[PDB]
């Protein structure tokens, strides 16, 4: 059955209106893009679209879009049997459920986000990184496509694994999680898809994507996974602009 979870929400109230945040956004970055109607056709995002994409006010109140605020650096403790639901069509990952969860706990990564990286990264040809690739005798594994260049995934992914001593699937799963934390969660101000994307606390500093819908799409995906498991997230950090009445106090 559906399992409700006691939410732990932090409300980051920003000392700027959404309007002023958009104004800072257009003046601090370049090449903000958005998809066309028929996808795989990027174009320039207008200011109105940028501002809409920045609207934490609409996202907070949305069932799926609130996941733009899920805290990706926090291990939740989701029942491992529920997690196996995400790994139905992925035997090799399914079997490592326990390893993914221990790595999520030890390296500080939300388990759904961690597995979604493994799921969406061992697909098609890349699955061979998860099964192991041989090299000069030993063998090496890569569960998140770390360092796997799109031109030559296996050689690069495997050589990266080799370079990092990932000679066991457990070492790759653990090491790979430490990589995800170090790379995507290295800043305390960018532990959510929303803050990763707009860096509202450090105007002008690194944003993780130029596609204005990057957080939206990735939140839909995480939300769907939780829904597929019949449960929900626990830790969230909402970003709220100073002109958002409906949430500035709450
Ligand atoms: Cl954050
Ligand atoms: Na600009």
mmCIF file of C-alpha atoms and ligand atoms in Angstrom:
data_model
loop_
_atom_site.group_PDB
_atom_site.id
_atom_site.type_symbol
_atom_site.label_atom_id
_atom_site.label_comp_id
_atom_site.label_asym_id
_atom_site.label_seq_id
_atom_site.Cartn_x
_atom_site.Cartn_y
_atom_site.Cartn_z
ATOM 1 C CA UNK A 1 0.000 0.000 0.000
ATOM 2 C CA UNK A 2 0.840 3.707 -0.158
ATOM 3 C CA UNK A 3 3.255 4.857 2.438
ATOM 4 C CA UNK A 4 3.043 8.433 3.668
ATOM 5 C CA UNK A 5 6.172 9.995 5.186
ATOM 6 C CA UNK A 6 6.634 12.625 7.830
ATOM 7 C CA UNK A 7 8.035 15.633 5.940
ATOM 8 C CA UNK A 8 11.071 17.597 7.115
ATOM 9 C CA UNK A 9 10.898 20.964 5.255
ATOM 10 C CA UNK A 10 13.234 23.912 5.446
ATOM 11 C CA UNK A 11 11.983 27.161 4.042
ATOM 12 C CA UNK A 12 14.713 29.319 2.587
ATOM 13 C CA UNK A 13 13.251 32.763 2.423
ATOM 14 C CA UNK A 14 15.191 34.851 -0.053
ATOM 15 C CA UNK A 15 15.597 38.618 0.424
ATOM 16 C CA UNK A 16 14.634 39.355 -3.266
ATOM 17 C CA UNK A 17 11.380 39.279 -5.240
ATOM 18 C CA UNK A 18 10.978 36.775 -8.128
ATOM 19 C CA UNK A 19 11.157 39.765 -10.449
ATOM 20 C CA UNK A 20 14.419 40.931 -9.106
ATOM 21 C CA UNK A 21 15.789 37.357 -9.133
ATOM 22 C CA UNK A 22 14.912 37.057 -12.863
ATOM 23 C CA UNK A 23 16.566 40.433 -13.484
ATOM 24 C CA UNK A 24 19.698 39.113 -11.778
ATOM 25 C CA UNK A 25 19.447 35.874 -13.748
ATOM 26 C CA UNK A 26 19.399 37.461 -17.203
ATOM 27 C CA UNK A 27 22.309 39.747 -16.297
ATOM 28 C CA UNK A 28 24.471 36.987 -14.727
ATOM 29 C CA UNK A 29 24.213 34.139 -17.252
ATOM 30 C CA UNK A 30 23.983 33.517 -20.985
ATOM 31 C CA UNK A 31 22.532 30.845 -23.240
ATOM 32 C CA UNK A 32 19.429 29.920 -21.380
ATOM 33 C CA UNK A 33 17.629 27.405 -23.579
ATOM 34 C CA UNK A 34 14.298 25.681 -23.909
ATOM 35 C CA UNK A 35 12.984 22.881 -26.035
ATOM 36 C CA UNK A 36 10.784 23.303 -29.076
ATOM 37 C CA UNK A 37 7.319 21.645 -29.328
ATOM 38 C CA UNK A 38 8.726 18.513 -30.962
ATOM 39 C CA UNK A 39 11.809 18.156 -28.704
ATOM 40 C CA UNK A 40 15.554 17.679 -29.529
ATOM 41 C CA UNK A 41 15.383 21.193 -30.979
ATOM 42 C CA UNK A 42 16.832 23.778 -28.533
ATOM 43 C CA UNK A 43 16.116 27.471 -28.883
ATOM 44 C CA UNK A 44 16.647 30.586 -26.763
ATOM 45 C CA UNK A 45 14.497 31.084 -23.713
ATOM 46 C CA UNK A 46 12.807 34.414 -23.431
ATOM 47 C CA UNK A 47 12.900 36.424 -20.180
ATOM 48 C CA UNK A 48 9.254 35.613 -19.415
ATOM 49 C CA UNK A 49 10.007 31.934 -19.808
ATOM 50 C CA UNK A 50 13.131 32.227 -17.613
ATOM 51 C CA UNK A 51 11.083 33.951 -14.908
ATOM 52 C CA UNK A 52 8.339 31.264 -15.190
ATOM 53 C CA UNK A 53 10.943 28.577 -14.959
ATOM 54 C CA UNK A 54 12.234 30.300 -11.775
ATOM 55 C CA UNK A 55 8.835 30.499 -10.103
ATOM 56 C CA UNK A 56 9.256 28.524 -6.930
ATOM 57 C CA UNK A 57 5.745 29.816 -6.041
ATOM 58 C CA UNK A 58 4.040 27.616 -8.662
ATOM 59 C CA UNK A 59 6.359 24.634 -8.119
ATOM 60 C CA UNK A 60 5.908 24.417 -4.289
ATOM 61 C CA UNK A 61 2.160 23.894 -4.640
ATOM 62 C CA UNK A 62 2.499 21.316 -7.386
ATOM 63 C CA UNK A 63 2.546 17.570 -6.558
ATOM 64 C CA UNK A 64 5.352 16.594 -8.861
ATOM 65 C CA UNK A 65 7.196 19.937 -9.110
ATOM 66 C CA UNK A 66 7.679 20.173 -5.297
ATOM 67 C CA UNK A 67 10.389 17.508 -6.013
ATOM 68 C CA UNK A 68 12.458 20.411 -7.506
ATOM 69 C CA UNK A 69 12.941 20.965 -3.781
ATOM 70 C CA UNK A 70 13.750 17.448 -2.621
ATOM 71 C CA UNK A 71 17.053 17.436 -0.604
ATOM 72 C CA UNK A 72 19.381 15.296 -2.743
ATOM 73 C CA UNK A 73 22.080 15.168 -0.135
ATOM 74 C CA UNK A 74 19.913 13.300 2.433
ATOM 75 C CA UNK A 75 19.557 9.541 2.711
ATOM 76 C CA UNK A 76 15.808 8.875 3.341
ATOM 77 C CA UNK A 77 15.754 5.203 4.541
ATOM 78 C CA UNK A 78 13.102 4.022 2.075
ATOM 79 C CA UNK A 79 12.116 0.385 2.392
ATOM 80 C CA UNK A 80 14.436 -1.622 0.292
ATOM 81 C CA UNK A 81 11.499 -3.607 -1.080
ATOM 82 C CA UNK A 82 9.994 -0.474 -2.441
ATOM 83 C CA UNK A 83 13.318 0.488 -4.041
ATOM 84 C CA UNK A 84 13.391 -2.811 -5.937
ATOM 85 C CA UNK A 85 10.288 -1.461 -7.799
ATOM 86 C CA UNK A 86 12.605 1.061 -9.503
ATOM 87 C CA UNK A 87 14.904 -1.819 -10.506
ATOM 88 C CA UNK A 88 12.406 -4.295 -11.982
ATOM 89 C CA UNK A 89 13.786 -4.296 -15.560
ATOM 90 C CA UNK A 90 17.394 -4.005 -14.341
ATOM 91 C CA UNK A 91 18.527 -7.290 -12.747
ATOM 92 C CA UNK A 92 22.142 -6.277 -12.234
ATOM 93 C CA UNK A 93 21.073 -3.117 -10.351
ATOM 94 C CA UNK A 94 18.243 -4.885 -8.574
ATOM 95 C CA UNK A 95 20.699 -7.261 -7.003
ATOM 96 C CA UNK A 96 22.801 -4.441 -5.672
ATOM 97 C CA UNK A 97 19.880 -2.765 -3.924
ATOM 98 C CA UNK A 98 21.575 -3.094 -0.568
ATOM 99 C CA UNK A 99 24.826 -1.668 -1.871
ATOM 100 C CA UNK A 100 23.154 1.398 -3.413
ATOM 101 C CA UNK A 101 21.332 2.089 -0.117
ATOM 102 C CA UNK A 102 24.447 1.706 2.024
ATOM 103 C CA UNK A 103 26.377 3.955 -0.415
ATOM 104 C CA UNK A 104 23.491 6.457 -0.326
ATOM 105 C CA UNK A 105 23.666 6.491 3.523
ATOM 106 C CA UNK A 106 27.432 6.569 3.812
ATOM 107 C CA UNK A 107 28.110 9.143 1.064
ATOM 108 C CA UNK A 108 25.062 11.277 1.738
ATOM 109 C CA UNK A 109 22.884 11.044 -1.359
ATOM 110 C CA UNK A 110 19.136 10.611 -1.585
ATOM 111 C CA UNK A 111 18.740 6.877 -2.708
ATOM 112 C CA UNK A 112 16.184 7.714 -5.398
ATOM 113 C CA UNK A 113 18.490 10.296 -6.940
ATOM 114 C CA UNK A 114 21.474 7.944 -6.643
ATOM 115 C CA UNK A 115 19.730 5.025 -8.344
ATOM 116 C CA UNK A 116 18.179 7.235 -11.008
ATOM 117 C CA UNK A 117 21.808 8.085 -11.907
ATOM 118 C CA UNK A 118 22.651 4.376 -12.143
ATOM 119 C CA UNK A 119 19.422 3.526 -14.033
ATOM 120 C CA UNK A 120 19.696 6.265 -16.589
ATOM 121 C CA UNK A 121 23.472 5.648 -16.917
ATOM 122 C CA UNK A 122 23.950 1.896 -17.432
ATOM 123 C CA UNK A 123 21.427 1.873 -20.316
ATOM 124 C CA UNK A 124 21.925 0.335 -23.766
ATOM 125 C CA UNK A 125 25.700 -0.163 -24.343
ATOM 126 C CA UNK A 126 26.717 1.362 -21.004
ATOM 127 C CA UNK A 127 25.348 -1.661 -19.168
ATOM 128 C CA UNK A 128 28.632 -3.282 -19.829
ATOM 129 C CA UNK A 129 30.306 -0.851 -17.504
ATOM 130 C CA UNK A 130 28.038 -2.241 -14.774
ATOM 131 C CA UNK A 131 28.905 -5.862 -15.753
ATOM 132 C CA UNK A 132 32.605 -5.098 -15.843
ATOM 133 C CA UNK A 133 35.102 -4.521 -18.615
ATOM 134 C CA UNK A 134 38.444 -6.205 -18.687
ATOM 135 C CA UNK A 135 41.682 -4.337 -18.970
ATOM 136 C CA UNK A 136 45.269 -5.612 -18.724
ATOM 137 C CA UNK A 137 44.264 -8.583 -16.648
ATOM 138 C CA UNK A 138 42.027 -7.224 -13.927
ATOM 139 C CA UNK A 139 38.459 -6.202 -14.427
ATOM 140 C CA UNK A 140 36.643 -2.935 -13.627
ATOM 141 C CA UNK A 141 33.119 -1.606 -12.985
ATOM 142 C CA UNK A 142 31.212 1.644 -13.384
ATOM 143 C CA UNK A 143 27.735 2.057 -12.176
ATOM 144 C CA UNK A 144 27.031 5.667 -13.027
ATOM 145 C CA UNK A 145 28.838 6.251 -16.253
ATOM 146 C CA UNK A 146 31.550 8.221 -14.576
ATOM 147 C CA UNK A 147 33.859 9.706 -17.024
ATOM 148 C CA UNK A 148 32.208 7.959 -19.934
ATOM 149 C CA UNK A 149 32.439 10.200 -22.855
ATOM 150 C CA UNK A 150 29.620 9.957 -25.199
ATOM 151 C CA UNK A 151 32.000 9.263 -28.247
ATOM 152 C CA UNK A 152 33.581 6.247 -26.597
ATOM 153 C CA UNK A 153 31.718 5.232 -23.443
ATOM 154 C CA UNK A 154 33.186 1.826 -22.668
ATOM 155 C CA UNK A 155 36.779 2.708 -23.120
ATOM 156 C CA UNK A 156 36.508 5.904 -21.233
ATOM 157 C CA UNK A 157 34.079 4.699 -18.558
ATOM 158 C CA UNK A 158 36.180 1.569 -17.997
ATOM 159 C CA UNK A 159 39.472 3.386 -17.997
ATOM 160 C CA UNK A 160 38.070 5.876 -15.519
ATOM 161 C CA UNK A 161 36.985 2.937 -13.340
ATOM 162 C CA UNK A 162 40.509 1.435 -13.707
ATOM 163 C CA UNK A 163 42.049 4.724 -12.787
ATOM 164 C CA UNK A 164 39.902 4.808 -9.656
ATOM 165 C CA UNK A 165 40.567 1.191 -8.594
ATOM 166 C CA UNK A 166 36.938 0.194 -9.117
ATOM 167 C CA UNK A 167 37.830 -3.525 -9.499
ATOM 168 C CA UNK A 168 34.604 -4.684 -7.717
ATOM 169 C CA UNK A 169 30.978 -3.642 -8.324
ATOM 170 C CA UNK A 170 30.845 -2.638 -4.583
ATOM 171 C CA UNK A 171 33.885 -0.364 -4.906
ATOM 172 C CA UNK A 172 32.293 1.215 -8.082
ATOM 173 C CA UNK A 173 28.938 1.689 -6.348
ATOM 174 C CA UNK A 174 30.452 3.297 -3.233
ATOM 175 C CA UNK A 175 33.177 5.242 -5.008
ATOM 176 C CA UNK A 176 30.745 6.291 -7.650
ATOM 177 C CA UNK A 177 28.381 7.671 -4.925
ATOM 178 C CA UNK A 178 31.219 9.669 -3.354
ATOM 179 C CA UNK A 179 31.672 11.008 -6.869
ATOM 180 C CA UNK A 180 28.036 12.087 -7.258
ATOM 181 C CA UNK A 181 28.186 13.843 -3.816
ATOM 182 C CA UNK A 182 31.501 15.583 -4.665
ATOM 183 C CA UNK A 183 30.371 16.667 -8.120
ATOM 184 C CA UNK A 184 26.679 17.536 -7.741
ATOM 185 C CA UNK A 185 26.426 18.310 -4.035
ATOM 186 C CA UNK A 186 29.716 19.917 -3.182
ATOM 187 C CA UNK A 187 27.951 23.161 -2.101
ATOM 188 C CA UNK A 188 25.475 23.390 0.821
ATOM 189 C CA UNK A 189 23.526 25.960 -1.255
ATOM 190 C CA UNK A 190 22.948 23.504 -4.206
ATOM 191 C CA UNK A 191 21.491 20.288 -2.785
ATOM 192 C CA UNK A 192 18.164 20.522 -4.611
ATOM 193 C CA UNK A 193 17.352 20.443 -8.386
ATOM 194 C CA UNK A 194 16.009 24.015 -8.000
ATOM 195 C CA UNK A 195 19.169 25.396 -6.331
ATOM 196 C CA UNK A 196 21.460 23.292 -8.517
ATOM 197 C CA UNK A 197 19.760 25.032 -11.514
ATOM 198 C CA UNK A 198 19.381 28.661 -10.342
ATOM 199 C CA UNK A 199 21.936 28.984 -7.504
ATOM 200 C CA UNK A 200 19.588 31.470 -5.784
ATOM 201 C CA UNK A 201 21.953 31.968 -2.864
ATOM 202 C CA UNK A 202 25.024 32.791 -4.952
ATOM 203 C CA UNK A 203 23.875 34.939 -7.864
ATOM 204 C CA UNK A 204 26.171 34.379 -10.813
ATOM 205 C CA UNK A 205 27.866 31.205 -9.541
ATOM 206 C CA UNK A 206 27.765 27.772 -11.204
ATOM 207 C CA UNK A 207 24.393 26.525 -12.469
ATOM 208 C CA UNK A 208 24.092 22.897 -13.435
ATOM 209 C CA UNK A 209 22.236 23.389 -16.700
ATOM 210 C CA UNK A 210 21.231 25.918 -19.358
ATOM 211 C CA UNK A 211 17.938 24.259 -20.191
ATOM 212 C CA UNK A 212 15.401 26.239 -18.231
ATOM 213 C CA UNK A 213 13.300 23.111 -17.836
ATOM 214 C CA UNK A 214 16.151 20.945 -16.461
ATOM 215 C CA UNK A 215 14.851 20.993 -12.879
ATOM 216 C CA UNK A 216 11.238 20.605 -13.998
ATOM 217 C CA UNK A 217 12.018 17.526 -16.030
ATOM 218 C CA UNK A 218 14.268 15.968 -13.467
ATOM 219 C CA UNK A 219 11.642 16.651 -10.730
ATOM 220 C CA UNK A 220 8.914 14.927 -12.830
ATOM 221 C CA UNK A 221 11.232 11.966 -13.099
ATOM 222 C CA UNK A 222 12.009 11.733 -9.368
ATOM 223 C CA UNK A 223 8.326 12.314 -8.484
ATOM 224 C CA UNK A 224 7.296 9.507 -10.852
ATOM 225 C CA UNK A 225 9.778 7.106 -9.274
ATOM 226 C CA UNK A 226 8.388 7.857 -5.749
ATOM 227 C CA UNK A 227 4.834 7.478 -7.077
ATOM 228 C CA UNK A 228 5.822 4.169 -8.765
ATOM 229 C CA UNK A 229 7.053 3.036 -5.367
ATOM 230 C CA UNK A 230 3.785 4.202 -3.707
ATOM 231 C CA UNK A 231 5.638 6.517 -1.273
ATOM 232 C CA UNK A 232 6.959 10.101 -1.161
ATOM 233 C CA UNK A 233 9.970 12.176 -0.315
ATOM 234 C CA UNK A 234 10.861 13.324 3.167
ATOM 235 C CA UNK A 235 13.457 16.218 3.173
ATOM 236 C CA UNK A 236 12.787 19.321 1.207
ATOM 237 C CA UNK A 237 14.281 22.793 1.118
ATOM 238 C CA UNK A 238 11.862 25.251 -0.462
ATOM 239 C CA UNK A 239 13.269 28.512 -1.919
ATOM 240 C CA UNK A 240 10.807 31.308 -1.485
ATOM 241 C CA UNK A 241 10.911 34.842 -2.891
ATOM 242 C CA UNK A 242 10.099 37.821 -0.743
ATOM 243 C CA UNK A 243 7.005 38.727 -2.774
ATOM 244 C CA UNK A 244 5.451 35.273 -2.463
ATOM 245 C CA UNK A 245 2.671 35.829 0.110
ATOM 246 C CA UNK A 246 1.241 32.300 -0.051
ATOM 247 C CA UNK A 247 4.586 30.957 1.245
ATOM 248 C CA UNK A 248 6.754 33.763 2.692
ATOM 249 C CA UNK A 249 5.411 32.998 6.122
ATOM 250 C CA UNK A 250 4.105 29.403 6.147
HETATM 251 CL CL1 LIG B 1 19.975 23.502 -1.481
HETATM 252 NA NA1 LIG B 2 22.511 37.276 -19.847
#
